[PDB]
Amino acid sequence: EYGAIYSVSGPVVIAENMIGCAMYELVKVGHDNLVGEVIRIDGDKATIQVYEETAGLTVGDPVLRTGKPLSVELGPGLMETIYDGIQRPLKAIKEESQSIYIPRGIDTPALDRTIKWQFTPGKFQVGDHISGGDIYGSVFENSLISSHKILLPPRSRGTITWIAPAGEYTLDEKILEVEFDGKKSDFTLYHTWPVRVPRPVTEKLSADYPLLTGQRVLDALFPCVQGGTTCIPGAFGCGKTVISQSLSKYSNSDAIIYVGCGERGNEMAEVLMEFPELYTEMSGTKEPIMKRTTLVANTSNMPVAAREASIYTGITLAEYFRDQGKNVSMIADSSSRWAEALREISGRLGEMPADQGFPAYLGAKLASFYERAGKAVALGSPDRTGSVSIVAAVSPAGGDFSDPVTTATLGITQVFWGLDKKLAQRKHFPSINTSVSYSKYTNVLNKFYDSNYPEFPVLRDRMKEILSNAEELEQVVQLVGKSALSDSDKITLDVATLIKEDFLQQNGYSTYDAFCPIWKTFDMMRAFISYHDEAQKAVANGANWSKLADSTGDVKHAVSSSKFFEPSRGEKEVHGEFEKLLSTMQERFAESTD
Amino acid sequence: EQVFPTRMTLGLMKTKLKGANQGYSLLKRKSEALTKRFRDITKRIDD
Amino acid sequence: FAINKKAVEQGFNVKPRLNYNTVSGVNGPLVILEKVKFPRYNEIVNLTLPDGTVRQGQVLEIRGDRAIVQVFEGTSGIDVKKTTVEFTGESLRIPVSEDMLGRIFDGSGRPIDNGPKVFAEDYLDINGSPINPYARIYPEEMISTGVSAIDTMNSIARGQKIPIFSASGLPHNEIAAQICRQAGLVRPEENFSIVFAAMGVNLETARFFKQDFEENGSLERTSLFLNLANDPTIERIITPRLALTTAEYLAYQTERHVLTILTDMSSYADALREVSAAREEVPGRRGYPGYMYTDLSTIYERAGRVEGRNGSITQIPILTMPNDDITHPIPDLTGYITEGQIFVDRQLHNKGIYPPINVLPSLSRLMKSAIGEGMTRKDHGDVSNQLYAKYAIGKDAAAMKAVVGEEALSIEDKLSLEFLEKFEKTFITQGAYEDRTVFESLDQAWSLLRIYPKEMLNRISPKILDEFYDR
Amino acid sequence: LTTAEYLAYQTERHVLTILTDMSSYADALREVSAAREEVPGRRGYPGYMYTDLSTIYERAGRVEGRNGSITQIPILTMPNDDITHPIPDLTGYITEGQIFVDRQLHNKGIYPPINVLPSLSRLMKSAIGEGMTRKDHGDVSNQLYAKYAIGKDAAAMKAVVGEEALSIEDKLSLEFLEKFEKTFITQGAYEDRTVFESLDQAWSLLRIYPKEMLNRISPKILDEFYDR
């Protein structure tokens, strides 16, 4: 029933006596049980792909069959875990081996098989008809998340003849007996799923609810809807780590799945050392972020197939967590590396190249992968709802954006947050080049603004035109100097500078400017536009703007200092203070005109 | 958008690009300086 | 301590060795046995030609009862009637002992210092398993190269991987020799060691390396793996594996801060293209095999500090761009895998500047973790930026000098013009045997900075300006 | 070639063969060996085309035993007006220099539209000289080539900058190039000139320049001839 090796060639192996094997089964080739997958079947012999190094193999070694394609186990215990590209626990492996290597031919359960979990029955009873995707019990996973639900895997129906009652169990105790034509069906606290097949869902919806990150510029001018895609350039000096950290700590999501898809290694060490120290404070300083995140690490040494399947694994995990009714936020690291791995695999298979040497799959693969994102209502009885929002990170070949990867990604995604290094030295620490970055979810977000903040769109637009006008104005200012410019032009210029240095720039470490909520930013841009338009109106009827600036230097300083105002104090008393400041500015301008 | 010599002439064209950039920057700065000195001549001749 | 039980268990067990005479065809650098029994991929074999000469090889493929051996030292003189092929029964292994230091090894690891055998303390598989990422940490402290233009502006934190790009006809080898000779830690040594593996080099360069390392005493801190140009290519691809394996053993089983150098990778790329042409894998981009990314990653990414052990490791691969273009695949991949790069300009070399390094394109991404207090003085990070900015300004100022005379230039421009020449002629220009500590280089940089008025050095913090600008 | 060899080496009479359009021959050679599946060479042509063309060309020269001569003047056809194509590349590798023909000159209505800049004849230095020809033949050619190159580069640079950045050398070179192209190269189909007349025309053209910038010419010949 086993298979004897018949040939070997680097990473290529040919089995024998293989009858009754699918085209993508998994096989435990070798005495050490190296993992592999069948590719081509020709009668009895079948080509096999290996992951580890094949040195030392010998003809006649038995070959086994797993019985499924590449799959990932899902269940309680994912949180606080650090995984390889192919669902391999690294902490447990290191502890078990006591070495500092990944000893080839090592197999340990993806999830711990010893920790006892306290299960609580759901809402069904014996003899009740059931359908796939229906919740039938919860589990307390952490103080942060305590409602880790238990589903019935899709493609499974029937009636339940026995359900275990409350108690404490491990992951190897059948807690349900679904009866069908064959009553063989048993179920435990976990199950598996092929990675390459998208999870079934009742129906997709239209994402409209905004995703707020806590930054000012992001949600002010280039918002991302909670459920959509986005892209940000990958550079060394840009310092994207700030964006990822802020998204992890201050966003309104409920589960983060960071994916390292091939890095220099040392960067992986840095991020792994850093994450367990980031702290969030909601209803008290809930110490870790690891209690809300699972991380997939893939250094360059990792096997090519593992380095390639990383994003598929991550997105599958995200979809699983979405179907529980929670909100998820995937974050890739370098899609360029994933494309590199895909091209390397294609080349090793010896297939026809395409544009710039890449294969022909890239377009379709990326399109499908991105389409896997979105917002939908889960598949089950309770009718919960979730959402997924991928955040890609494209790195170029050598800076140029002519590569197919960048073109396809930009064509697919909807939001781009351009980062510039030049701002780094000037320390606009949120280093967003406002002349390039853009968003396309405004048309939907207006249907939320009107319900909550009707004036937001006109204000954000107004500052968009203000910034464009100021940057254009400076061009001719250099040519002819400010001398030949009217007072209105100088007003535009200086208000643009004030906005640049207050509204956009953000320390990110001060207790007050670390995390700016929505209403606070609402008040800020309202106040800034009011100041500018009131000043220009006052100048319109006739007045030397120099004298006006001399009179209202205090008002300008007050509006600037309003940014230093500490939020998290009343969250409506702040609104009262902002109203007081606005009225004070109005009456000060009125008196100044006199 | 040119006469198309396709015979591994990449280096020549890259050299032309670099020369164009250098000349552009140098002439820009020369014009800046000359205009700056033109302003004072205008003022002094007027006075 | 129980390692003795394992050593004896697999130690005192002799096994026989087959011997074949069924050579049944040959194709260039290959050889095709016919009736092998239970072959084993990637074995080691010892051919015996009819004249009594002896060679070696390593299988590549196995059909049903067949092997395809490739011989290291060519294939001329073999025959299909009298040659006898002897199998080994286990892959290539290296003899490892603490006392490599001082000795010189050939490409395959046979000592060539006219000394006794290694007296191995153990045996190992050359290509070990990858490091577990979860058990890895960040660089922290600095390594003192002794080169002014490197340490001051491109410090190397232990655990980094900084390649040194260079052109064909440049003195990169001399720079590498000087670096290996002057390396060491910083004391604001009983823990330092170097591995210096050279692949694909002339005879003169090898002799110069040996003679210089002999009479300069550095030999007993190093262990060279020389491989001349006329030696088999397979041995070439093998050599870096041996060097990395021995360095890893030392670092992570004796807790020694070690530094490794390679002195070339283009010739490694050539040796690699040669393989997969013996096989029928079609050529990839620019003729190179497509899958070079994986194996180059394997070579490089056995570096960095480790969680538990106190040891460490560092790499300085040396490339050679064919026609001085970064677009070539080799430098592209190396930059992709490694952190920052060190350039070597041709023009500076033409002007007699040694080491002919240009700093404008240079970069080291882990600097920020290298400099600091205790680990070094407090003013390194500011002087670095200041000097970089002023050099960049001086270049363009010299450019404009020819077009707009000299008087029209601002006072800043004249000062920068003078500073550029002074910097080039004094700071970077270092004697072949002039060794400088980081402190001395910092002092010289301060001396050069003293050209400008105190106020104008904007990028430097006022605290440092007040503290050190005096005198 | 066999007929030419017979006539030249077994009848003692000088010969001059003119075989046309080697491009068609090479194309036909490619067609064969494509019905086969031999390892194709650069741009699909057979690898052994070098040896084939060497076989074709080498039948030429002279032998001491006889006193007849054989001379080859093959005609080529670059596909896309590019000299890097394998056919012309190998032909240049084999033969002793070649005479180029340019599209630009023909466009400007100049006959014979020969471009001297990329052309050469390796045996010229051995054939020319005193006794055989006028002594100035071996250096006036070099001087004219240098001046032509200077004029061409000066015009190319001026095309983007203009006259303002031109010294005396560029101004002289442009006019000299114009006169040379429009008077020396051009000649009627049935018009012919001996070597001496061409030399006299060359000196007339060169006399434009002052006596001191003709550095590439030896002082003796310059003094002897440029005087009058």
DSSP, residue by residue, C274-308:
HTTTTTTPPP-GGGS-TTHHHHHHHHHTS-S-BSS
Contact of C142 with C310, CB cutoff 8 Å: no
Q: Which residues in chain B have Cβ-Cβ distances shorter than 8 Å to C399? A: 22, 26
Looking at the partner chain, which of A6, A57, A357 has a beta carbon nearest the beta carbon of C41?
A57
Looking at the partner chain, which of A57, A103, A265 has a beta carbon nearest the beta carbon of C304?
A265
Q: Are residues A202 and A294 in the same domain?
A: yes
What is the maximum span of chain C, computed from C-alpha positions, in angstroms? 88
Mind giving me the DSSP string for D157-198?
HHTTS-STT--HHHHHHHHHHHHIIIIII---SS----HHHH
Q: Are residues A472 and A343 in the same domain?
A: no
Q: Which of B26, B35, B36 to mutate to test the interface with C (most CBs of C within 10 A)?
A: B26
Which run of H or E residues covers position D60? none
In this structure, how many other beta carbons lie within 10 angstroms of the beta carbon of residue A259?
Answer: 27
Q: Give B6 to chain D, closest Cα distance, Å.
A: 9
Q: Are residues A97 and A167 in the same domain?
A: no
Paired tokens of D117? 């800049």
| CA A48, chain centre distance (Å) | 34
Residues 6+ apart with CB under 8 A from A138: A119, A120, A122, A147, A148, A149, A150
Q: Chains with 3 or more CB pairs closer than 8 angstroms to B?
A: C, D
With CB atoms and an 8 Å threshold, state whether B8 touches D82. no
Structure resolution in Å? Answer: 3.8
With CB atoms and an 8 Å threshold, state whether C281 touches A398. no
Q: Give D42 to chain B, closest Cα distance, Å.
A: 15
Q: Which of D89, D157, D160, D164 to mutate to test the interface with B (most CBs of B within 10 A)?
A: D160
With CB atoms and an 8 Å threshold, state whether C40 touches A56. yes
Contact of A243 with A428, CB cutoff 8 Å: no
Q: Which of C162, C248, C336, C362 to mutate to test the interface with A (most CBs of A within 10 A)?
A: C336
Which run of H or E residues covers position C381? helix C380-401
Q: Give A76 to chain C, closest Cα distance, Å.
A: 22
Contact of A255 with A403, CB cutoff 8 Å: no
Residue type, A87: Q
Residues 6+ apart with CB under 8 A from A422: none
Alpha-carbon span C68 to C32, nearest angstrom: 5
Which run of H or E residues covers position C316? strand C315-316
D82/B contact by beta carbon, under 8 A: yes
Alpha-carbon span C434 to A75, nearest angstrom: 64
Q: Are residues A168 and A40 in the same domain?
A: no
Residues 6+ apart with CB under 8 A from C292: C269, C272, C284, C329, C333
With CB atoms and an 8 Å threshold, state whether A300 touches C337. yes
Residue A183 forms beta bridges with which residues? none
Q: Are residues A248 and A281 in the same domain?
A: yes
C30/A contact by beta carbon, under 8 A: no
Closest chain C residue to the Cα of A51, Cα to Cα: C294
D164/B contact by beta carbon, under 8 A: no
Pairing relationship of beta strands C30-33 and A224-225 according to DSSP bridges: unpaired
Alpha-carbon span C457 to D89, nearest angstrom: 60
Q: Are residues A48 and A194 in the same domain?
A: no
B14/C contact by beta carbon, under 8 A: no
With CB atoms and an 8 Å threshold, state whether B29 touches C404. yes
Alpha-carbon span A533 to A593, nearest angstrom: 14
Looking at the partner chain, which of C297, C309, C338 has a beta carbon nearest the beta carbon of A301?
C297
Known binder of ligand: residue D134? no
With CB atoms and an 8 Å threshold, state whether C62 touches A8. yes
With CB atoms and an 8 Å threshold, state whether B33 touches C404. yes
Q: Are residues A40 and A158 in the same domain?
A: no
Mind giving me the DSSP string for A494-543?
HHHHHHIIIII---SSSTTTSS--HHHHHHHHHHHHHHHHHHHHHHHTT-
D84/B contact by beta carbon, under 8 A: yes
Alpha-carbon span A539 to C431, nearest angstrom: 68
Final residue in a domain of this structure, among A133, A165, A187 = A187
With CB atoms and an 8 Å threshold, state whether A269 touches C40. no
Going across the sheet that includes A167-169, the strands are A148-149, A137-139, A117-121, A167-169
Paired tokens of A283? 């209803």
Contact of A338 with A359, CB cutoff 8 Å: no
Half-sphere exposure (Cβ direction) of A479: Cα atoms closer than 13 Å:
6
B29/C contact by beta carbon, under 8 A: yes
Which residue segment(s) compose the domain that A552 sits in? 440-594
Question: If DSSP states are collapsed to H, E and C, what string results for A162-215?
Answer: EECCCEEECCCCCCEEEECCCCCCCECCCEEEECCCCCCCCEEECCCCEECCCC
What are the φ and ψ backbone dihedral angles of A479, each rounded to 5 degrees? -70, -50
Mind giving me the DSSP string for C189-256?
--SEEEEEE--SB-HHHHHHHHHHHHHTSGGGG--EE--BTTS-HHHHHHHHHHHHHHHHHHHHHH--
Q: Are residues A543 and A432 in the same domain?
A: no
Q: Which residues in chain C have Cβ-Cβ distances shorter than 8 Å to A90? A: 132-134
Q: Give D80 to chain B, closest Cα distance, Å.
A: 10
The CA–CA distances, whole Å, from D11 to C122, C230, D4 equal 85, 55, 10
Q: Give A300 to chain C, closest Cα distance, Å.
A: 6
Paired tokens of A22? 């699918």
Q: Which residues in chain D have Cβ-Cβ distances shorter than 8 Å to B6? A: 80, 82
* Counted domains in chain A: 4
Residue type, A443: N
Which run of H or E residues covers position A267? helix A266-274
Q: Are residues A426 and A520 in the same domain?
A: no
Residue D32 burial by CB count (10 A; 0-12/13-18/19+): exposed, middle or buried? Answer: exposed
Please give the DSSP secondary-structure letter assigned to residue A153: P
Q: Are residues A20 and A94 in the same domain?
A: no
Q: Are residues A214 and A226 in the same domain?
A: yes
Paired tokens of A480? 């002819």
Residue type, C353: I
B8/D contact by beta carbon, under 8 A: yes
State the angle between helix axes of A456-480 and A518-540 in degrees (0 to 180), rounded to the nearest 10: 50
Q: Are residues A64 and A78 in the same domain?
A: no
Expt. technique: cryo-EM
| b/e D139-177 (16+ beta carbons within 10 angstroms → b) | bbbebbeebbebbeebeeebeeeeeeebeeebebbbebb
| CA A524, chain centre distance (Å) | 28
Q: Give C333 to chain A, closest Cα distance, Å.
A: 10
Contact of A14 with A73, CB cutoff 8 Å: no
Residue C46, helix vs strand vs coil? strand
Final residue in a domain of this structure, among A70, A103, A125 = A70
Alpha-carbon span A288 to A284, nearest angstrom: 12
Pairing relationship of beta strands D100-101 and C257-261 according to DSSP bridges: unpaired
The CA–CA distances, whole Å, from D108 to A151, A480, D113, D153, D181 equal 84, 49, 9, 19, 10
Pairing relationship of beta strands A82-83 and A293-296 according to DSSP bridges: parallel
Final residue in a domain of this structure, among A405, A439, A473 = A439
In this structure, how many other beta carbons lie within 10 angstroms of the beta carbon of residue B20?
Answer: 11
The CA–CA distances, whole Å, from A124 to A139, A156, A162, A169, D218 equal 16, 16, 11, 19, 112
